[PDB]
Design a protein around this motif. Structure first.
Motif, PDB file in Angstrom:
ATOM      1  N   UNK A  19      -6.686  36.318  36.374  1.00 42.32           N
ATOM      2  CA  UNK A  19      -6.469  35.756  35.050  1.00 42.32           C
ATOM      3  C   UNK A  19      -5.903  34.350  35.141  1.00 42.32           C
ATOM      4  N   UNK A  20      -4.964  34.128  36.058  1.00 47.27           N
ATOM      5  CA  UNK A  20      -4.348  32.812  36.139  1.00 47.27           C
ATOM      6  C   UNK A  20      -5.309  31.770  36.686  1.00 47.27           C
ATOM      7  N   UNK A  21      -6.163  32.130  37.644  1.00 45.44           N
ATOM      8  CA  UNK A  21      -7.110  31.123  38.111  1.00 45.44           C
ATOM      9  C   UNK A  21      -8.104  30.793  37.010  1.00 45.44           C
ATOM     10  N   UNK A  22      -8.538  31.798  36.250  1.00 44.68           N
ATOM     11  CA  UNK A  22      -9.394  31.505  35.110  1.00 44.68           C
ATOM     12  C   UNK A  22      -8.707  30.541  34.157  1.00 44.68           C
ATOM     13  N   UNK A  23      -7.440  30.802  33.847  1.00 46.42           N
ATOM     14  CA  UNK A  23      -6.724  29.963  32.897  1.00 46.42           C
ATOM     15  C   UNK A  23      -6.546  28.543  33.421  1.00 46.42           C
ATOM     16  N   UNK A  24      -6.267  28.386  34.716  1.00 42.06           N
ATOM     17  CA  UNK A  24      -6.034  27.038  35.236  1.00 42.06           C
ATOM     18  C   UNK A  24      -7.329  26.238  35.303  1.00 42.06           C
ATOM     19  N   UNK A  25      -8.447  26.859  35.689  1.00 42.36           N
ATOM     20  CA  UNK A  25      -9.704  26.117  35.632  1.00 42.36           C
ATOM     21  C   UNK A  25     -10.080  25.765  34.206  1.00 42.36           C
ATOM     22  N   UNK A  26      -9.833  26.668  33.258  1.00 42.82           N
ATOM     23  CA  UNK A  26     -10.263  26.414  31.889  1.00 42.82           C
ATOM     24  C   UNK A  26      -9.571  25.190  31.304  1.00 42.82           C
ATOM     25  N   UNK A  27      -8.243  25.141  31.378  1.00 47.76           N
ATOM     26  CA  UNK A  27      -7.481  24.089  30.720  1.00 47.76           C
ATOM     27  C   UNK A  27      -7.058  23.000  31.695  1.00 47.76           C
ATOM     28  N   UNK A  28      -6.488  23.376  32.834  1.00 48.66           N
ATOM     29  CA  UNK A  28      -6.055  22.400  33.811  1.00 48.66           C
ATOM     30  C   UNK A  28      -4.558  22.379  34.020  1.00 48.66           C
ATOM     31  N   UNK A  29      -3.848  23.307  33.389  1.00 46.80           N
ATOM     32  CA  UNK A  29      -2.406  23.398  33.564  1.00 46.80           C
ATOM     33  C   UNK A  29      -1.950  24.797  33.196  1.00 46.80           C
ATOM     34  N   UNK A  30      -0.942  25.287  33.905  1.00 43.15           N
ATOM     35  CA  UNK A  30      -0.360  26.602  33.685  1.00 43.15           C
ATOM     36  C   UNK A  30       1.151  26.447  33.698  1.00 43.15           C
TER      37      UNK A  30
END
Ligand SMILES: [Mg+2]
Ligand SMILES: [Mg+2]
Ligand SMILES: [Mg+2]
Ligand SMILES: [Mg+2]
Ligand SMILES: [Mg+2]
Ligand SMILES: [Mg+2]
Ligand SMILES: [Mg+2]
Ligand SMILES: [Mg+2]
Ligand SMILES: [Mg+2]
Lengths: 119, 285, 92, 47
Positions: A19-30
């Motif tokens: 989930x976190x890798x999906x989120x970081x690729x999608x937006x660019x920041x976590x």
RNA sequence: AUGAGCAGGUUGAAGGUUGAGUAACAUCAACUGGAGGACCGAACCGACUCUCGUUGAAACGAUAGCGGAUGACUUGUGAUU
RNA sequence: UGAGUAACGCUUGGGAGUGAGAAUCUCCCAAACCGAUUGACUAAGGUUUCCUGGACCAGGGUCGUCCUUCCAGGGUUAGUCUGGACCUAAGCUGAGGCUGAAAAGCGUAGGCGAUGGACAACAGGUUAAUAUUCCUGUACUUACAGUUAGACUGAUGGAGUGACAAAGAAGGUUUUCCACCCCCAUAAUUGGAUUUGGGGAUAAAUCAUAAGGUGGUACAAUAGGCAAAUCCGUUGUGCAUAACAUUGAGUGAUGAUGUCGAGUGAAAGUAGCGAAGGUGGUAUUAAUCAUGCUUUCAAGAAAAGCUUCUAGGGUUAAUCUAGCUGUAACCAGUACCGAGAACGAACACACGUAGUCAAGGAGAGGAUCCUAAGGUUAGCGAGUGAACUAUAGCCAAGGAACUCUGCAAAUUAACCCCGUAAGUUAGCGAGAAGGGGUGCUUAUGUAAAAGUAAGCCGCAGUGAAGAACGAGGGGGGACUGUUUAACUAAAACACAACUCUAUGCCAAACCGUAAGGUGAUGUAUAUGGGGUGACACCUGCCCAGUGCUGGAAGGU
């Protein structure tokens, strides 16, 4: 004691990573906990490095990890990765991301950390 | 007659029996006449105060009492006809549906032997002796099986009306009243010569040999469990206590209450009916 | 016919929503013991329009003012809505 | 488990109610005592 | 007193019809029939064993097993001692 | 003080927003459990907990801008629904009356008393919150007059119906289901596709039609059915083999140029738009006909109501029936929860609580594994991965040596095919014991399938989950059952059966002071009591003592 929550089973850890890798690729920041960020970074780097060649085998191998987000769906996120994120990094040997430490949280005094990625 | 019930249910073995209810009765399918049925309220061994007075009585099924003309008094010198021999649940005998020629129905007790289409009668004067008739005892000749007897005149059939019961005539006393009756169970009473009677023994002679086979069958028939006094504690029974299978310590066996029990005479001999007795199943008066 | 059975009207958003239609359902609060027959006869002799249909509900009392050192109980009231034919409308 | 107070308002009313207690001598006596001690909740008929 | 409930699946009684046989019975074979305080097992009921908890989640329970489950069954509502 | 120690009572990750402040609130996107349920409808209860706006003293095992908390405002709409206005059961009360120092107790007529009987409404829409209640469309009922026509009505009373068990099975008709077909969007960059995904219905009521179910039917006498009888009952005669009466799921047509509808979609997926709205098979499934049928014994509610009957009345017409016009249809309940947070548990507690709806794949199934419709984040977190504890998993060789005992734990495990002893009440034992096969493809298989032959893969093929470990001898009790809620479920209790005794009807025994009542609307082939305890064979000796029964002269 007896009845107890399932807790951080290995599946929980790996699914959080996805989930976190999906989120970081999608937006660019976590903005997550530090000790989940240091664990997300490894899988992030491995994906971006595996994604510079673009054959269909790499598409299959990356399909095993991504999940769809509000910004991009998975088959949109794959194109977004391989079009602009992966080739941007094509010449950098390693070092695709950074984890910087924020201030402690008010709820738990956990060490908030920000995960991002820039050239 | 009786008929076995081969169970082949593999939980214990019970050689249960039941009266055939097919070769004895007419149209075993239960369609009793509606005009002569009143429901029975099962008191269940209880009392108007609600306490228990007769122990281990309860849990019987729902029945429907059949109004039986034990009196045989409203229809005299008028012929009848037996229509069916139905099984009324209350009493062990077999009840029959008769229809007096004016068109009036009734349930009576079926003397053993009568069948569909027979003729029965009731009167006050000398009439024939065929089973099912009724008349005062002074007219029935000595020796005939007599049932549905009654003690007081015009009082309807109390005495000797059970499955397979009867009573014999034994002449008359010295008074000129009081025809003598040899009742069942060895006694011998003096019935008044104005008392009615019905000839012929009562039907269903084989109710003695039907064997309830499972505790249930007996529970559904109205008899609940009975607990021996030696199982009791010393409280609520004279036979209680004792550290393990102790016997009946007191000199004689005792009832659940404190009464002396075994073979102790109990009849209230200061009663009007003691002089209507010749013998009391054992000896004189 | 004392017309003591028309205590008060109530003006709420629901009443306006139902009233601006064609049936023109007014609403009133009536004596807790009053009945629909008395209500509609009273309406006849207070305004002059024989009403079509009458409906009554009652709001059972509950706790009021909650926790305020002197908690209390609410008021038992019977609300009757009164319907009218299509082309008619009156005011209070 | 099944506790010792399963409520059913018809039973409660018929058993401790005012028409229940105003029909035997002992009930009249208990109403006497409760008026004497001045209970606001005289019987269970009032909430 | 009055109502409700028992998923699903097996075994296939007594009786009866037919054929042989019987001097006529008895007996036997096929088919029908569908009983039982029957069978295996969920809901349901009960509570045999371990472990845990024993200032507990709980003033008597949980996971896992466990016996009955068309019957002396289980259960709601009302009345009563 | 113990101590800022144990505990915080089953679950995640992030983006955007808000706000002084966010893990904790709102939205979005996933993710993880539930799915014979954590889903949907309601009874019982509880009593405003419901909806909108606002607040963050206290309650929330943390926080909080937020709560099922608090504050202000609001919401519950019936001729047909649950219940009264109708009915009765158990039972409760009970005028007179009976009995009892007193209070009270018993009880008749009457009256109450649902968990039951009888009584007429369907579909869709709408609001933040209500809905067979409001609205739209179409209906039915029960009274009331006035009117047209026909007819003599026929009860506070008689009769019939109402009015009934448990189990089992087989049929009829729609359905589920299967196939075909019309419709809609879809046509795809990861190698390949010429598809893939979804939907396919319309109610009570009115009219005709109704397969099938039940149970003779007409005529004449009548002495019975507190009187009355043309009704019922009873007895004769003919037809009989289907007439007659009565009931009846379903079918078609109206209802319906309506509503609904997959999807599309403006100013929120809302408003509005809204295509198809079908044909056949059915060796499978549930539901209705059915208060049907058959069988068996433990012999299977009352009354009101409906139809009818005469009495009673009515004619110088009352009353009823069918239609038309008009009028009326009362009283309380109706929100919300219905429980891992609104009920009973002292709580936002792992517990308990009647009934109803109950999807798909494999499967006998409501089992079991995963999912759907829909619904929840188990109101403390973040780490580390020491001893130690619980829980799961695993353990070579050995395989019961530990031990009080193989307690626990482990092996077998469904379906299909072979085969199955000793003993016996000849029913069982027995799923005995003991073994084998199981997957995919092709062809054959019958109507579907099981099966059959050939072939192919793997270490292993009910590939996972959910399914009996067994043999042999002994003691007890015959068995199935019940029991010490909350340490004993047993060899105790029960039981079928046996015997003994009491009891001749105002029975005996029993509760009550008595009345009254049970026993029993029973009658010795019956009822109470004591004792043993299926079935088979046996039940020896003593009547001095105790007890029991009888005794007839005597003694006290
Ligand atoms: Mg310490
Ligand atoms: Mg410590
Ligand atoms: Mg701690
Ligand atoms: Mg619960
Ligand atoms: Mg329930
Ligand atoms: Mg299922
Ligand atoms: Mg399941
Ligand atoms: Mg014994
Ligand atoms: Mg013994």
């Amino acid at each position: 004691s007896y009845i107890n929550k399932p807790g951080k089973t290995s599946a929980w850890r790996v699914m959080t990573v996805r989930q976190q890798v999906s989120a970081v690729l999608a937006y660019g920041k976590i903005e997550t906990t530090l000790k989940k960020a240091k664990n997300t970074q490894k899988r992030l780097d491995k994906l971006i490095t595996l994604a510079k060649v673009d054959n269909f085998n790499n598409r299959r191998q990356v399909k095993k990890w991504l999940l769809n987000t509000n910004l991009f769906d998975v088959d949109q996120l794959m194109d977004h990765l391989f079009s602009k994120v992966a080739p941007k990094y094509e010449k950098t040997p390693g070092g695709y991301s950074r984890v910087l430490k924020l201030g402690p949280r008010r709820g738990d005094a956990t060490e908030m950390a920000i995960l991002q990625l820039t050239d | 007659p009786i008929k076995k019930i081969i169970s082949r249910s593999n939980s214990g073995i019970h050689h249960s029996t039941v009266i055939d209810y097919k070769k004895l009765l007419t149209t075993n399918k239960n369609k009793p006449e509606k005009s002569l049925l009143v429901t029975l309220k099962k008191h269940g061994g209880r009392n108007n105060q609600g306490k228990i007075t007769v122990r281990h009585q309860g849990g019987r099924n729902k029945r429907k009492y059949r109004i039986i003309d034990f009196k045989r008094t409203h229809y005299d010198n008028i012929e009848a006809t037996v229509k069916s021999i139905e099984y009324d649940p209350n009493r062990s005998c077999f009840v029959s549906l008769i229809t007096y020629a004016n068109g009036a129905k009734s349930y009576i007790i079926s003397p053993d032997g009568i069948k569909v289409g027979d003729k029965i009668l009731a009167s006050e004067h000398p009439i024939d002796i065929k089973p099912g008739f009724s008349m005062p005892l002074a007219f029935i000749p000595e020796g005939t099986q007599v049932h549905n007897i009654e003690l007081h005149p015009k009082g309807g059939g109390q005495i000797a009306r059970s499955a397979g019961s009867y009573a014999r005539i034994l002449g008359q006393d010295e008074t000129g009243k009081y025809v003598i009756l040899q009742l069942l169970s060895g006694e011998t009473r003096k019935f008044l010569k104005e008392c009615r009677a019905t000839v012929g023994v009562v039907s269903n002679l084989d109710h003695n040999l039907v064997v309830i086979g499972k505790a249930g069958r007996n529970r559904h028939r109205g008899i609940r469990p009975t607990v021996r006094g030696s199982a009791m504690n010393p409280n609520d029974h004279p036979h209680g206590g004792g550290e393990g299978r102790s016997p009946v310590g007191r000199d004689a066996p005792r009832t659940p209450w404190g009464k002396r029990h075994m073979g102790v005479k109990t009849r209230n001999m200061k009663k009007a009916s003691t002089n209507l007795i010749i013998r009391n199943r054992k000896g004189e008066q | 016919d004392v017309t003591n059975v028309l205590l008060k009207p109530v003006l709420t958003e629901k009443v306006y929503f139902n009233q601006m239609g064609e049936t023109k359902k007014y609403v009133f609060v009536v004596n807790p013991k009053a009945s629909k027959t008395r209500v509609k006869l009273a309406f006849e002799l207070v305004y002059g329009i024989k009403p079509l249909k009458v409906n009554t509900l009652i709001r059972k009392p509950t706790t009021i003012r909650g926790g305020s050192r002197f908690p209390g109980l609410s008021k038992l009231e019977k609300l009757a809505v009164i319907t009218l034919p299509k082309g008619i409308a009156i005011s209070v | 488990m099944k506790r010792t107070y399963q409520p059913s308002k018809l039973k409660r009313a018929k058993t401790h109610g005012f028409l229940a207690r105003m029909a035997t001598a002992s009930g009249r006596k208990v109403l006497k005592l409760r008026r004497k001690k001045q209970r606001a909740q005289l019987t269970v008929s009032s909430e």
